[PDB]
Motif scaffolding. Structure first.
Motif, mmCIF file in Angstrom:
data_model
loop_
_atom_site.group_PDB
_atom_site.id
_atom_site.type_symbol
_atom_site.label_atom_id
_atom_site.label_comp_id
_atom_site.label_asym_id
_atom_site.label_seq_id
_atom_site.Cartn_x
_atom_site.Cartn_y
_atom_site.Cartn_z
ATOM 1 N N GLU A 168 10.991 31.939 23.354
ATOM 2 C CA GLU A 168 12.369 32.201 23.753
ATOM 3 C C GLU A 168 12.425 32.970 25.067
ATOM 4 O OE1 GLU A 168 14.151 34.212 20.551
ATOM 5 O OE2 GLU A 168 14.414 32.498 19.328
ATOM 6 N N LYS A 169 11.582 33.988 25.188
ATOM 7 C CA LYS A 169 11.650 34.911 26.315
ATOM 8 C C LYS A 169 11.261 34.221 27.617
ATOM 9 C CE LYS A 169 10.064 39.019 26.159
ATOM 10 N NZ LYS A 169 9.007 40.055 26.001
ATOM 11 N N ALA A 170 10.265 33.343 27.540
ATOM 12 C CA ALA A 170 9.655 32.772 28.734
ATOM 13 C C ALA A 170 10.636 31.877 29.480
ATOM 14 C CB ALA A 170 8.398 31.997 28.367
ATOM 15 N N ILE A 171 11.384 31.075 28.732
ATOM 16 C CA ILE A 171 12.226 30.040 29.321
ATOM 17 C C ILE A 171 13.466 30.642 29.971
ATOM 18 C CG2 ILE A 171 13.460 27.886 28.930
ATOM 19 C CD1 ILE A 171 10.287 28.088 28.468
ATOM 20 N N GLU A 172 13.842 31.835 29.522
ATOM 21 C CA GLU A 172 14.969 32.552 30.106
ATOM 22 C C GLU A 172 14.881 32.574 31.626
ATOM 23 O OE1 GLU A 172 17.749 33.936 28.678
ATOM 24 O OE2 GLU A 172 17.053 32.651 27.138
ATOM 25 N N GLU A 173 13.660 32.673 32.142
ATOM 26 C CA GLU A 173 13.427 32.597 33.579
ATOM 27 C C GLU A 173 13.784 31.220 34.123
ATOM 28 O OE1 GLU A 173 9.405 33.622 34.022
ATOM 29 O OE2 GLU A 173 9.684 35.720 33.854
ATOM 30 N N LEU A 174 13.438 30.184 33.368
ATOM 31 C CA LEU A 174 13.753 28.813 33.755
ATOM 32 C C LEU A 174 15.259 28.585 33.794
ATOM 33 C CD1 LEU A 174 10.926 28.364 33.938
ATOM 34 C CD2 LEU A 174 10.980 26.701 32.064
ATOM 35 N N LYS A 175 15.968 29.184 32.844
ATOM 36 C CA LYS A 175 17.425 29.144 32.834
ATOM 37 C C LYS A 175 18.003 29.775 34.095
ATOM 38 C CE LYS A 175 17.747 29.333 27.769
ATOM 39 N NZ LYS A 175 18.286 30.091 26.607
ATOM 40 N N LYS A 176 17.389 30.867 34.537
ATOM 41 C CA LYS A 176 17.760 31.497 35.798
ATOM 42 C C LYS A 176 17.357 30.632 36.986
ATOM 43 C CE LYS A 176 17.498 36.272 34.094
ATOM 44 N NZ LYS A 176 16.734 37.548 34.144
ATOM 45 N N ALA A 177 16.318 29.825 36.797
ATOM 46 C CA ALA A 177 15.767 29.020 37.881
ATOM 47 C C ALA A 177 16.535 27.716 38.045
ATOM 48 C CB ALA A 177 14.291 28.742 37.636
ATOM 49 N N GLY A 178 17.459 27.459 37.125
ATOM 50 C CA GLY A 178 18.304 26.274 37.198
ATOM 51 C C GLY A 178 17.667 25.096 36.472
ATOM 52 N N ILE A 179 16.719 25.395 35.591
ATOM 53 C CA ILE A 179 16.045 24.362 34.811
ATOM 54 C C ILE A 179 16.786 24.084 33.509
ATOM 55 C CG2 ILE A 179 13.907 23.654 33.694
ATOM 56 C CD1 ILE A 179 13.699 23.854 36.702
ATOM 57 N N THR A 180 17.045 22.809 33.242
ATOM 58 C CA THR A 180 17.794 22.411 32.057
ATOM 59 C C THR A 180 17.026 21.378 31.242
ATOM 60 O OG1 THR A 180 19.007 20.682 33.257
ATOM 61 C CG2 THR A 180 20.002 22.875 33.166
ATOM 62 N N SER A 181 15.874 20.961 31.757
ATOM 63 C CA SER A 181 15.073 19.931 31.109
ATOM 64 C C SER A 181 14.674 20.348 29.700
ATOM 65 C CB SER A 181 13.840 19.629 31.939
ATOM 66 O OG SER A 181 13.041 18.639 31.353
ATOM 67 N N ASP A 182 15.285 19.715 28.704
ATOM 68 C CA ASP A 182 14.963 19.988 27.309
ATOM 69 C C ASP A 182 13.578 19.464 26.951
ATOM 70 O OD1 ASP A 182 17.418 21.186 26.894
ATOM 71 O OD2 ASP A 182 18.334 19.486 26.020
ATOM 72 N N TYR A 183 13.138 18.434 27.664
ATOM 73 C CA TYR A 183 11.825 17.844 27.428
ATOM 74 C C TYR A 183 10.725 18.894 27.518
ATOM 75 C CZ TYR A 183 7.632 15.008 28.116
ATOM 76 O OH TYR A 183 6.373 14.459 28.016
ATOM 77 N N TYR A 184 10.649 19.568 28.661
ATOM 78 C CA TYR A 184 9.600 20.551 28.902
ATOM 79 C C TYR A 184 9.809 21.799 28.055
ATOM 80 C CZ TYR A 184 8.203 17.747 32.939
ATOM 81 O OH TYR A 184 7.771 16.729 33.757
ATOM 82 N N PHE A 185 11.067 22.090 27.740
ATOM 83 C CA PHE A 185 11.394 23.160 26.804
ATOM 84 C C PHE A 185 10.837 22.868 25.418
ATOM 85 C CE2 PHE A 185 15.387 24.801 29.204
ATOM 86 C CZ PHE A 185 14.630 24.863 30.354
ATOM 87 N N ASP A 186 10.695 21.586 25.100
ATOM 88 C CA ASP A 186 10.104 21.172 23.832
ATOM 89 C C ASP A 186 8.613 21.477 23.794
ATOM 90 O OD1 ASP A 186 10.611 19.687 21.258
ATOM 91 O OD2 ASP A 186 9.264 18.261 22.059
ATOM 92 N N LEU A 187 7.959 21.354 24.943
ATOM 93 C CA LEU A 187 6.505 21.444 25.011
ATOM 94 C C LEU A 187 6.019 22.825 24.592
ATOM 95 C CD1 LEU A 187 6.877 18.762 26.409
ATOM 96 C CD2 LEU A 187 5.169 19.467 28.100
#
Length: 52
Positions: free
Chosen positions: A13-32
């Protein structure tokens, strides 16, 4: 279920929060990172996305 899995659950959960800030929305890689039954996996996988 385990304490280590609880920490990893937080790692996921914590790691992707940065990706959310980075403008990343790809659920695919969020699955990985969910496939990343290891903590190192979650960071290693995301690393490509964070540095995309």
């Amino acid at each position: 279920g385990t304490i280590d899995e609880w920490l990893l659950k937080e790692a996921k959960e914590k790691a992707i929060e940065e990706l959310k800030k980075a403008g990343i929305t790809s659920d695919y890689y969020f699955d990985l990172i969910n496939k990343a039954k290891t903590v190192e996996g979650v960071n290693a996988l995301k690393d490509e996305i964070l540095k995309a």
